[PDB]
Design goal:
Elements: H1 7-17, E1 26-31, E2 35-40, E3 44-49, H2 52-68, E4 79-82, E5 94-97, E6 102-103, H3 106-111, H4 114-132, H5 147-162, H6 168-182, E7 193-195, E8 204-207, E9 212-216, E10 223-225, H7 229-232, H8 243-253, H9 258-283, H10 286-298
Antiparallel strand pairs: 1-2, 2-3, 3-5, 4-5, 6-8, 7-10, 8-9
Bound molecules: chloride ion.
The site of chloride ion has 5 residues, from helix 2.
Binding site for Mg(2+) 2: 218, 221
Binding site for Mg(2+) 1: 203, 218
Binding site for adenosine: 97, 99, 218
Length: 299
């Protein structure tokens, strides 16, 4: 079950741990699948978890940000307030400094003058180059997300989930899809590093007076995994920036195997149907689950 909050309960939660912090203004600033976010005093964003899974992502975000706060070339959220663990949440809330700016939507990017588009690609490449070069020696080993392990896990999850839903031959071809990707070593041979892992246009903030990127946000999915993940998340022509712009990022990053990035993107496009089934059933999102179930049913 998901949780809702009133403004009064948000204030009461903060006041229990921060009695000297006066709240003058509060409004909802956004809502995602994991947290509801509140703009408080017009200078802070407080995230409150909608469920236990979302609180684990929030706890991860807080811990990662504290490890990397002064290591990057763009502003990232700074943790200023933290809640506490309970039997229900790893972290009851967290409060971050607000970064002023708007998302660098594909529409906003493509209306920019070319010189500013090029600066945006360069700034993103430097951000990712520095992120992926952060020394990960100290980091907790459970942050490592091995992609081959993940694909094997999902295959077992899908069999468990769909054993009574799919007809025998349908499940056989699900098993075939998994077998084929697991035999292709290009997806699983990478050098692990710290990655953002949700590196998309909605998480890139832009200063429209300077026409420059002024922040990267929402680090709750960060992990030690394949650096190519942070390029393929920007490659979709519909919802993101497309291949031409991402190729500019790849050049400034000095990527040496662009064909492999493309092959990984192609497979992730196909793999989304299975992710929608998994996280559809997990979150209570039957919309997604039925959508993924119909997609794998036909193609
Ligand atoms: Cl921080």
């Amino acid at each position: 079950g998901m949780r809702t909050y009133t403004f009064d309960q948000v204030e009461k939660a903060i006041e229990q741990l921060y009695p000297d912090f006066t709240i003058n203004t509060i409004e909802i600033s956004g809502e995602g699948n994991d947290c509801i976010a509140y703009e408080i005093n017009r200078d802070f964003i407080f995230k409150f978890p909608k469920h236990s899974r979302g609180s684990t992502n929030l706890f991860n975000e807080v811990n990662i940000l504290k490890r990397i706060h002064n290591k990057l070339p763009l502003p990232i959220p700074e943790v200023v307030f933290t809640g506490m663990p309970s039997e229900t949440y790893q972290m009851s809330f967290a409060g971050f400094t607000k970064i002023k700016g708007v998302p660098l939507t594909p529409l906003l990017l493509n209306n920019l003058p070319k010189q500013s588009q090029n600066q945006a690609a360069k700034d993103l490449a430097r951000f990712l180059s520095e992120l992926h070069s952060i020394n990960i020696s100290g980091f907790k080993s459970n942050l490592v997300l091995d992609f081959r392990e993940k694909i094997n896990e999902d295959n077992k999850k899908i069999k468990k989930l769909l054993s009574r839903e799919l007809k025998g031959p349908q499940m056989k071809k699900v098993d075939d899809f998994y077998r084929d990707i697991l035999e292709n070593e290009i997806y699983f041979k990478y050098y692990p590093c710290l990655i953002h892992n949700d590196f998309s246009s909605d998480h890139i903030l832009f200063d429209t007076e300077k026409n420059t990127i002024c922040g990267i946000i929402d680090f709750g999915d960060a992990a030690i995994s394949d650096p190519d993940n942070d390029f393929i998340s920007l490659m979709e022509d519909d919802e993101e920036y497309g291949m031409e712009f991402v190729s500019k990022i790849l050049n400034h990053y000095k990527h040496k195997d662009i064909p492999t990035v493309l092959e990984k993107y192609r497979m992730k496009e196909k793999y989304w149907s299975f992710e929608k089934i998994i996280y559809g059933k997990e979150y209570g999102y039957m919309d997604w689950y039925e959508e993924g179930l119909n997609e794998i049913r036909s193609i």
